[model samples]
Target: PVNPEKLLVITVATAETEGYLRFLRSAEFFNYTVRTLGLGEEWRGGDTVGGGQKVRWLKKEMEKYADREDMIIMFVDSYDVILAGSPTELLKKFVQSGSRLLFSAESFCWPEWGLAEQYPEVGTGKRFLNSGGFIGFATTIHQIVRQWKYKDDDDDQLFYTRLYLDPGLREKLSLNLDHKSRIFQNLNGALDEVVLKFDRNRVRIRNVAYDTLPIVVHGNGPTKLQLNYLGNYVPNGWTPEGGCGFCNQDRQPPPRVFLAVFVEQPTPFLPRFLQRLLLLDYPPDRVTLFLHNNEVFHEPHIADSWPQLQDHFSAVKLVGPEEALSPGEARDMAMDLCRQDPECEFYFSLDADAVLTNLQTLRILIEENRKVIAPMLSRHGKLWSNFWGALSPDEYYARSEDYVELVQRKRVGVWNVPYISQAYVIRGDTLRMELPQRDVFSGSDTDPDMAFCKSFRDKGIFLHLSNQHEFGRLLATSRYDTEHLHPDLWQIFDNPVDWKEQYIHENYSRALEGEGIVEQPCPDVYWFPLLSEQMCDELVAEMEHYGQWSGGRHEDSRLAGGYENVPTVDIHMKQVGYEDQWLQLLRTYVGPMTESLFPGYHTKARAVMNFVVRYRPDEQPSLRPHHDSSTFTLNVALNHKGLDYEGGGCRFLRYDCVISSPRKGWALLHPGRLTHYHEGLPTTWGTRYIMVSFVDP
Candidate 1:
């Protein structure tokens, strides 16, 4: 048995880093007494020099406890180390080894491979000395460090190797190498031997070759990435039952942010995109907005919504297409806006296609506390995401083994990635200190996002992507056409869910629920709320914008034969490029109600004569009584009768039942060809509009 109170952990770190902070957190969790040395000091030992400055600092600090013979001192590198076991387990393992002073072992010798033959050989374990981790009694540790007589730039490992080679000093000090890695494990060449052992509550690192659980894990040489992978799970960083144990730590009040929104092309759902930004679960007064619209197609959208955004945000700046700024130039300006503001703590960049559905996206990203991090976003029902798992030899996209699992979220955690685009947050301090170059986005021939990520990669900065929660989705903009007045109305196939959510009535689901709002005003005639007010108004405005309604005549040039049996002042759906979209809407939304009302009758949901009729007292006020040439028909009132127009309603002549008040956005569904004969009521005061469709003919 060993005393936990007698063990003292010491480390030397010139500066704090992400890995160093992780090391401290692991130490604190294990109830270890740690003494950090040389913090904020200049490191005179270069990378190739093996850091003799570490030896000087350790020797100076060990002098305080040298007289206490009962004390045990353990020294390890700070940045690339993690304590896996408690002090009791560590000291117990040390006493079982029966060595007064011990050093870690590695597969290959460093600094001097020529001296390999001069050292003693081991039978079944590593034979080289690694100075990254060492442990000993106070008196022996004081003696070993006090022998450092070299300058701060000399090799500390070479000094230890010379002493270990000296038989006199080795025997006198009872020095030995931990060949089996019972207490210390260096992870350069021994990565395959070490495996993560999961307990019921926590995780531990086990050295399978030595059949021992190592107390101190050291990531020496170029194994920093492998060490980071292990550190993500071991020592309570994450667990199967509990996720992201460190996510809620070190949280602070929400900081001021500079939000940059980019609309570089003709994107779909721009209004909804801006509305989502307005709905972010953050204080609007703390965000300053910078919007860059590079296409003239979205100028009207920006002109209409800029005032409301300006009222909500702390400050708003819009760079329209008239400026002719390139995408890279605009991105550079956005980063500079944050860098120049002393009060800006974070810079958030969001493209128009990345729709953030989670209201807490901004708050969750701010709480992550990373230098550069992105929330994982993918297209709905697709595997294409914002962050790349691996890069090719040419620094393009490549698939890593864990790419599918990461995207599907089979393994959930924050991951270090090579490239990220669309939406991400960057810290202001990192922007000012690490990315001070003004041409970060324009330095290469690639896109702005690729060039920006390359700059971080060149500077040795790690970009992280987190899939801890569902944030949002990426819009498919490849087929988005801006030729129509309301382009989003034509996105039924590309974005079906969003289209239905925006265009369908709020109470449309209630009608589908059965026993909710389906009303039968006339015999065999059904009335239900169908479209939203916005959909009605947008359809009206779109038709008015075209300004080409047919005259009330019997001859029509739009038809295949250029003859109309029953005609009115109307415009065909084909005139505005909405014929296919209207058919799909009928098949998707209206088909369910039809199948339920007419039992055992599965009608082929097709439509040919789809048009909008305009009614005015000066032109065609009412339609003559006629039967529609179809199985059934759908007529949606596009304007309020009492508000926008005056008397207009359908009357069933067979039952003598008339719907006097035509509600806007409500649809009247009845049999068309044989059963129900109806006529349009007259419009007395103003103009009226109705959308008519013939289905299953």
Candidate 2:
């Protein structure tokens, strides 16, 4: 192995940002010795959008190391640069260039477009110079920077561009451009050709069009977004099979974290969310928990998850509604705690609805070494995300170019977005010094999330949202009603994964197989065990709690445009805000069953009418023979036959079939439209209830 001191890498940054931290980590992986200059200093550099004062600062720093002729000095722009290979690999690539000063390449000329004709012509590769990255012998780099006598705010690339255009100076300095990107690849004009490739050993950026590999990558101009994407995979970051390779579990001296858990709204599945949070793959002794419960409805949840949390974490602080702290005040209090505790390295904030399914989520985010970062979270099957890709003219939400692609996982990477919330990790020092004020969480007409993020935006803090790993989803808490016995049962659309575990029959998945063996109670009627007994009981109880059923009238006003020709004594699922949930359940649990029974027919289980029918001897004993206004219909028994009712059954007049003693939690699927008209058999003794949904009307 070569002595590490033989190579010295230098980068200039005004402050430590997430991008700069990522740059440092890439170097750390290669064991490269690096010096970061001008930290905590103000940059008089011209706006980075069009220009910067990089050369002015680098010129002064270069004077110190100029005398060491045996050393190699590599200079790279900090905020948007990354090292893809080791110093040894970099040295080898540099030596092959056969030039003392090899500047990174781009396709277009900048600052002085008229001087483009003075540059050397190339046949097959980029021909312009990009000053973002370069490597040279110490004395030669010094000789080049010695020419600079400009002030801090002057344009640096213009100075370098003029020098490269001067033939005499270029020849004297032995300067050349890495046209084919053998060492330094600028991503601004070349994103079309490069792609990330993964193998068993490592992840690399392959120039697919050229079939070449470059060691140093730079994101220049507005291409920083592209660089963020490439950074997710390059340097062995993450993959599907092995997950986050960069997040090593054996990190020495594990980070001290302050967990700020907020229950801002009365959310469904609170116990499950808390269980997932407690099971995160991180050391408990290193974590200090601060729980803020603003909703009186969540007192039971906090009380249940509190004692165990006290024993599990190193320390715990509980703030209830009695404290009378608003969401904004609670956020400020937690931020202050993280700042005051010197042992606290990071502050992790999570709202109740942010459900993290993966155990490695916290470890991965902590290992990212970013100042402020959030895992991409969104509503299931929805485009709504915690991070907005763009803001409107008045600072609301607008769409960015890659917003949909990123949210849908069509593109995978860490992205620099303008706003992020619900869950995030911020470096403690950043929370302390960078965002020190308590007013950050408050604004005249802005929400707390928007107000807090606006402060970060105004302070020039880059908020990064990463979709590099599967971090789970956001619970949809829109119009979540707490009045029900079990409110979470109605969240199938928002929490489908958890809802299935709770309600779907254990063996219900078996019915999805081809030619599924279903019991035929009567001819043309298929009986399948669909929902669990618990689900049936809950649905029945939920309907009873509503306690408003139709009069079983022939001319009903509750039906289509307030006109139902034949309506049963029933209650619609829409009465309890469960209409959408029921439809989603049909699509999820019943759709597959329908496909199995009726071959070559596919539906999302959509229906215009979904309601529970009640049959009693006095009110409604039996229905006259009639054809259903649907392609198919599902009648799910909500109450046990012979127990809840003495005699209640279905009779198909066309098939001369009868299905009595209907089992609870089982659904009878039958054709509804033409050849098979049916009638409800009379109920003799007790009340009988059944859930009916007309499909394909």
Candidate 3:
């Protein structure tokens, strides 16, 4: 804490208002005039909350203080907290020392929000600040620098939201943001390595510190509240507490969120989602996935998908869907499993469709520490339970199916779950006794969670409710990201080159960089909804048997007589080993609950695609501009996201269709020969052995 006069506020953030405010307060408190520092929505060059609005505000105000020479730009979230001592006294001598501009590693801006030890680290207050209060340093208007990212979100901005999900991302990000305070140790839990260095360095300059912890703190890092947040106007003169910043409740045991998945049918991406669920902000080993193999489906392959799922989700303890008792027997086998697995505290029996967005939300769940917590269901209109008293699928669908009319709060939430089964969770052993081997109502077709709630009521666990988690819900991006028929919401068939430059590139870059990983307090366990062996093998064989090089040949204009021949699957197999790679790829893409490859689609876009340079006897790489019978065509490049390649553009003759290079799980879709004629260009640089095909059913 030298002279705080030279400290400037620089904000490295994404699209969040709170993030900008955190930066503004850091600089304003420093008592320094701005000279191109303290950028928020005002800065045009980077991402601030409210999109460009915040940046515009920042740029507009910047001209006003350009003459000042005390601007140190950049709002930091690192070591800004200073609860130990008065920053004014520590830095008073710096002003006399005649330092024109200064940067302190000891800056304490962002303090922990709650009574720290009580809540999780992320459980801090919603706002951002530094305990150092402010810095009034000298500054000069230097050149303006701009930060660019794929979308509005920059590296740091992406880091924040992403780190919320992927805890490991924080460690990777630290090497660049704040290498000093042993932020690396935060990743490895190796604080002992830096404690000695941190203690010895009472004061450090940001750049002076470089990659070492030369200063005790940096940014508005931690322990800032007790020292900053002064009531008085300037240095020295201060009341015990002047600024009436509303102090919220200090958290207690913090938010403890655990996930329990109950599956009757396998979701398309359930296993992938579960792996992420297992490694959330909580202790990795603590997370549990309850794979309830409780129901069956019409598709034999649906049952076939089970063993692979079970094997893939090998980390999880497999439980029987039901104990074989009499036809009407009801057993609480699942409940008993939960009771035995004591580590499963505060469980969330999520619908497979639910996707987690915020890691902080998980932490919040943990801090609340309820026996059962379910996000409030919008479909339920608030909190509700949907019970089917012995109705068929048609009957269930036919009935208004509204459970609101039946609301006698079960003491342990036993009456019935008042919401749809897309997602829900409840306390484990609040109640005792086994359930019937068979279901009481609708057999296995309706809500069993409500029945479990009944057991909770029978015991004494309070049934808690929450708002719909935006993170958990299906997103338009999930659908729009692909080339779907919903052209209004997303871009339609464009040249693969254009598509790659737009959405595909960013998505590709993100995936390659390990974009979607997350952390769960409990051990990651895949809760696979089981399938039968026969069904599984059937799917395998069907894919292997049916998936062959398409049946079509150029019926030559001059009566077909060139030995160069029509392209066939045999030719593709020799070059790409596509048939051999098919199974391995399916293992990666085909999730537990899948009949067709596309499960989330409202109506399957019908078509398929491939990779080949259609050449006639005289022609080298050319195909006639003709359409096929298929209503839809799709091509997915099983390679990385956006590898800049040349020549292999899949183009549409009538409409601007797209080509497939190496988009891992991404694909290209277009109306078949009905609306457009297409061409598959040759790739001179890279091998485009694409998984090309068409569909219409």
Candidate 4:
């Protein structure tokens, strides 16, 4: 168990004019541990800088140590932190102090990004000991090493540190290695632990002091040096890298997206996919890609006429494993790459080998403020972004992203951004977490990305924002692999689910609970005064028949049930419905639109229709108006579209707002098919009616 063979010599790689990593590794401590892990393939023939497949395999191997070590998992980034004397001394001191996580507060390798001003380093300069990039995760820290993957923008870790101040989740996760009672540390969103400036020698011999160390850092050390694994290296060679790898394109920063495209292997159209992104007004420097090598990145020699891709997308870098990984690992590697390249601000993991066609979509994603934006993937078929239960049919029509002309907007929770990030760009912070919300990574009917977007949206993140693109593009692009797109984005499958055919499918006309169109019903009531004695008596007769209304089949001008936002008309008659018995049952509950549509008639008509429509539960046609031909027409409620009923009334629901029992002047009229809507006034007993005629279209 005391065998040091289990330990690894961890270090980053650098482009070497000379050998810098080699010098650091030759030091007493690195020499003691022996080379265990390297940044690139040349490092003892092992690799460190990789994502997609390589990253996946490396992490899976790394995860093997999660529960194994009451040991330290030492890691360093390209920024700072170097080795010292021998690991034997550090391990001796670690055992002597009985501390699980041991880190030296030295040369606070703190860089001056926007984060520096707010969160300065500690120990070295009148502050708490900054945790250098050099970190020793004790056995416990080691177990949780892979538990929390690093993000490019590591804010949650900052939160985790702050919790030590309160000691809530730490107690839950048993993070007792850190001493919060001794210090009150605040961290930057990036979780760059501020440390005391010192080299391995300087920290090796120092007075132990605690200051404003937000997290982990090593302040004083060789700022930057070229990397050399076991080769000759020198400390003085590397130029001090000030802040981060990202340039100062902050204000109008380009969209550096991690597009995960699976282009068809051996194809020519991949250039068009790149052109779609390049043509956008956004800067090319902001776009990055990890193409699933459905095709070769360095295309193989073939026909001479194929357009050279490198010419159009010189700025784009294509990388991916020839091998496929689980969706979880793919995501983890994406996060890892983002952690490496700060320029990559967002991660957009796509599935279509080449589904995205429009260049404008990139701009629309940011403009709409959507955490996840899915274009109309297909019109003929359905795409299960799976954020919502179904994909939006709106892909067939061109609407504005500003136009939230949604058929249905589902409600989500705090962490759920209620939108699908289909071909979306999400903030780096979101990508850092492991598959969240207990998402079972089964590669099932749902796309992990879309499903993940939904999971986040349900936690209060938005998803499924659409930019106008339709069937043509969906079919053209998503039909990958096939000569023509088979499961076309524009696939209009007449029957998505086909009942297994049986020649005996010949029918049994036996009343099979026929739906007869169980229409969406509204419970709004409209009423009006009876026009004359004849009208009054006619209403009375209507009420007489209204009571005998059996099928409970409600349609026509009104319907009533559990449904909300159904349209209706209220025309108030002075006295009507029953001549033999004077009854005033309809004038009960009313909404403003009821009065607006019927004018003065609302004063009486609600009672007339109330008696007739309310009783017939199955009266679908009686609730609202339909369309005809010839001249356009306007139908106003002579009175209120309200009635006394246990359930159901009138409605005039529009795209954004819903109006019930519309009043006079405000007559609701749209073209026939689009606006042939109605509200139902369902009553256990009563009569409701409307006097209306359509002008020829």
Candidate 5:
């Protein structure tokens, strides 16, 4: 019987890498006693020249433990290996193999294919010996390494292969190949044979071809990316029962972060975007802000919102459009600022279009402890996301098989991607060391984000995209315009959820969920709260911002016949570029109420006479009683009766109901053209405003 405490894991790594740390994590998880060698020593293993330095290090380190005959030594490559099974399972499997030394098997013979005929053939599994991993008794392993008399620049695999090829030496040492991968699963040519087996709380690498669980997994050659993909889940990296097992393992204190915010174009919902940044659940004293606004149109927005953000962060740096720096230059400057500061531990870049709804996004990303990672942000209801699943041959976008699954969150984990933009965080050490060049965002005429991601790709730096949590979404900014007082009002079609949340009443859902929320003031008139106070105030401000009120005259050129029997001071919806958006609001919000109240009347949600009417005591206070030229009419009070205005309500003369003192943001819906004849009550004191829409005219 093999004892778990007597088995020792040994590896040689010249420096710690992301892969090495991952290997170490897996070893720790499975409770292995690991002894690392060759640390702080320069690597003599050239790309295609040699790996004998590993053998040399192993020989020197194994000599100290060579006298312990009962001890077992498990040697594996640290940079490209992961311990997937426990010590007890590994020791049991090793004891059952009935061999003194076992080397991992692979499909191809490396460095010396001509000696393939001299090697013994296997019956069921791979034939060649791969020196990536091996296991044996302490003395036998010591003997194997002590025979390596070659220079440090020689090939280590060739040495092991030659010894294994010798029949007498193989028989003497009882050296065998793990043909069925009972212990080690090398993934060079055997990727198809290995599949991840997920259990209740953990995942394991199962070799389907051998029907055995692999103890050691080696990403030998071109399968490093695939190994990284598997490493994101296997051996307790992430699981359904416990998300991101490594997220909280090595978390440090909250570090000082440099926030680079870019407003390169005239973005929609910019005010809300700024508000979200301020709402992040991070200490303000630990954050340094750098804002670059490249659009002249967005200067006013920045100027209005700058006061609240200026003193909120530790330090604030602004680069206006007048500075004449391009987007690429601005990004480069931001990176340089972070790299030059010793206190800054992370650099977070954010574009204006990415709205981070999760308040814990910053903390979660920092706790993830990656060199470069981005929270996956996608356009709502669209497949377009911030990260590309695969890159084309020419280094452009290409879809992988799991792209749709990852985007839709059918599979949730941190993914290694080729391109990530809109929002990402980079480690300060990565900027100062791995990517020290200041012109990372330059060298390409393409966008700065593309050039930046391409630089990381060229440097062999992996860009990660995480979807472990619902972080945020990307806003659609292609058709956004700044021609109105509140450009977000026109976003009903682009960002419907946000638009509804901002414009619709807080209790609007309650009205739709129950029966008695809608009140009937008159016989056929339905009154309900619909719009939010912000929506009402913005509508009034938008009309006043336009500063153009039609004269209350009978001869009106805006109408169909250029004549109106009764008129008031008003501004048409088309005058402010809100006609289409208002129609959509009617179809989405008002149509539901109309359908609920009047079951059989399916009126077309169209309106030609959509306007906001203003009432004053001196200028056309009251409208004469008249029949609206429509199947239905919706009149929404845009101001409070006692606060913003006084004495402005509708009077249904047919029902003999004078519904006065209308609440702000409440709408009165009634049938028109025949049944309910209504007139606008006079405004006694303050100027009153109401949005009038005659539907299906």
Candidate 6:
């Protein structure tokens, strides 16, 4: 039996490019004993890459091992090769093949396609010989290469092809090609044959066509980029159940990161966004925060969140609206500051709308170790992603075939994209070299994000979008307004997720369950608690701030016809810029309840008379029995029944039912123009406030 220590792995690489680093990581992950030979050496061949330089380097380096007859020499390319199995598994696979000298095989013959017919025919595998990967006994490989007489710049594949083709030399060396890729899987024209298998605590690339598991994977041509993506998880790099072992295992002190946070737009949920940043799983001492708040509306929020971040982080730099810096300038400056810092390993660019709910996002991205990468992000249940899978003919946004699948997690992998924004992590090295100029985000009449993405694409820097895990979500900042009393409540149209979180009742979700039921106060009046106490208070305050309640009179000019026969002292939702908001609430909250009670009713609660009617014993204490001019009406109690008022409730005159006590934050609903003719009971003591809306009028 051959000793496992006799096996040796060798590769040639001059510079530490992204490809080389990934190759190094693959070597490190499998604990392979590898020797890189071409570092700090000048190439004797042309600029374009070929196998000539690699062959020349390996031939020169093989001189020392010439006398080691009992040793095994495994030579492979560093930049495009990754180890899928351990060294022992690789050695075992090689030993299973009885040939003294073995070479990698591919489906196509390169450098000299006309000489294909001269080679020996194969039964069920690729016939051509490839020089990218080979394993052999030291003595046999030396005998084969001893006949090499070509110059360092000469084509190496032709030399090897001629030797392998000659029957006499092949017999002398006992040579054989790994035709079915039992030892090496060369991915050039056979990309479809390989598929990544992540199961049972390991990641392996299965050669589907040949039904084999190759130990070494080679990306010979355009497939190199795809191999880099696969290398992110293959060879036990990351697992579905365990997540990323490299990310979770902190073997050393954490790498320092420059958190470049840009609050450029007037965005809602800025406070929660900042808290999610601070909650990142990375060590606080290793992070240097750079905040750029360009929105005047977010100044107060920054003023409050800034003090809390000062003591928890290594350092925090604040550039408020007082600085008056442009968005492009601020982002560029933050990147430059990260580049200047020697300790900074990464620059995390996070826009305010990029609400990263995943605390492990930073660590996961860092562990993937790409030069420029971003996690997949978009608004909840929306397709607005941070990546453009394809560019339009006019260089604008276009969709790729797998864009939706990638974002929706139907396909899980690190994909090369044309554009990424909202948030991304760029290596400090890439930031300095690729974007040395400050105006990387400046173009003629182009948006800043478009300019930034275009420059990176022009530089040949790929912006990768990783959907390997759930990263977070993107917030829509276009309709965010700071002018409202509670700006987040108004975000139902733009940001329904955040709006529902802050205003919608927690139990309102339960009302949507399959067995959920709506509460009925009277025979036909259904009730559901849809808003929080804060929402009740804010809505009342918003109405009072307008201070233009219509006086109880026979005629009113606020209507479309400039007249109202039955009028009360009330304020319209449109008067306080809340008409659209209230309509959305009814559609979102009341529409569901409408469906729950009256199964066939299908109205959006689009009403003409949506107002808050106040009742007082001195002025208009009670309302006459009248039918509402709507399909259904929604009455929400804004204050406590007995605490804020007394003797204030509703009475259904047809059913002879009266709810004298209404709970705060609860709403009452009934058919408006049907059998439920109702009237407001008198407020005998204190002021009573009820938000009323005649739906589908």
- TM-scores of the candidates are 0.82, 0.63, 0.33, 0.26, 0.84, 0.70
lDDT of 6 by residue, 1-697 (tens): 5666788888988777656666778777778778898899876755433557777677777877787889898888887788888778878888888888899999998887898898788998988998888899988877767667667678777778888999988888789899999999999978879888877566889999899999889988666545755665677556666545443334298689999899888888888787777788999999999999998888888888888799889999999999988888888789889877777889999988887767988988888777788989977998888878777657788876557877788757676676889889988888777667777766357877888887776664667777878888888877667787668767888888877877777777776664545577788788877787777887778877777877735342122222335567788887887888888888888888788778777887788778888888988787766777777888888888778789977999889999878878688888877587777888998888888888887
Model 4 C-alpha RMSD to native: 23.3
lDDT of 1 by residue, 529-591 (tens): 899998999988888888899984543212212244567888888988788988898989888
How far residue 260's Cα lies from its native spot in candidate 5, in Å, is 1.6
Clashes of each: 0, 0, 118, 189, 0, 0
Please give, for residues 1-697, the per-residue lDDT of candidate 3 as tens digits.
4435544443333333322333334435445333333334333434222233223333444455555654433322322221122335334433433433222222222223232232123221122211122222212212121211233223332222222233353233221222233211121122223222112312122222223322222222221221122101112111123321211113234222244454444333333454555345555344544554443321233244545444543245444445332212222444445555554444455644455555544554444444445543221123323232122333332222223322322211112122234344444433222222223212453345445544443333334443323323331222323221112112222122222232222333343333452111112111121222222232223334434533367332110123433343213322333333333222322221122323353333322232332222223433435454454444444333235234555656554534433234444444454455555565445323334444442
Query: Which has the better TM-score: candidate 1, or candidate 3?
Result: 1
TM-score ranking from best candidate downward? 5, 1, 6, 2, 3, 4
By the TM-score metric, which is better: model 2 or model 6?
6
The lowest-lDDT stretch of 10 consecutive residues in candidate 2 is 554-563
Ranking by lDDT: 5, 1, 2, 6, 4, 3
Provide the lowest-lDDT 10-residue window in model 3: 518-527
Q: Candidate 4 lDDT, tens digit per residue, 1-697? A: 2345544544444232112332343344245442223344432322222222222223455565666554455443322333433455445444543544433322222332233333333433332223322234434544434444544234322322343233443444444322321221222211233232333222221213333222222222221211111011111111123211111112166566655554434333443344454465556455665644434332432112124334444344444435555555555455456645656667665543334545555555555443444544442234333233222433122332212222222211111113343355666554444223334223446655545544553343334434233312332333333232211111122211111011001121111122231111222222222132333333434434334442323332322343433343222222232321211211211222234433452333222222222233434334443332312222333233343323333444443224444432122332233443433334333334433323222
> Each model's C-alpha lDDT?
0.85, 0.81, 0.33, 0.34, 0.86, 0.80
Clashes of 6: 0
TM-score of 1: 0.82
> Which is the leading candidate under TM-score?
5
**Model 2: pairs clashing at backbone N, Cα or C within 3 Å:** none
Candidate 4 lDDT for residue 164: 28
Collision pairs in model 1: none
Superposed model 4: Cα runs more than 4 Å off? 1-255, 264-271, 294-321, 324-328, 353-357, 380-422, 432-447, 454-460, 467-472, 476-697
Q: Which residue pairs in candidate 5 have backbone atoms (N, alpha carbon, C) closer than 3 angstroms, thus clashing?
A: none
**lDDT by residue for model 5 over 342-433, one digit each (tens)?**
89999999999998988888888888878999999989999999988866656678886568988999877787777899889999999988
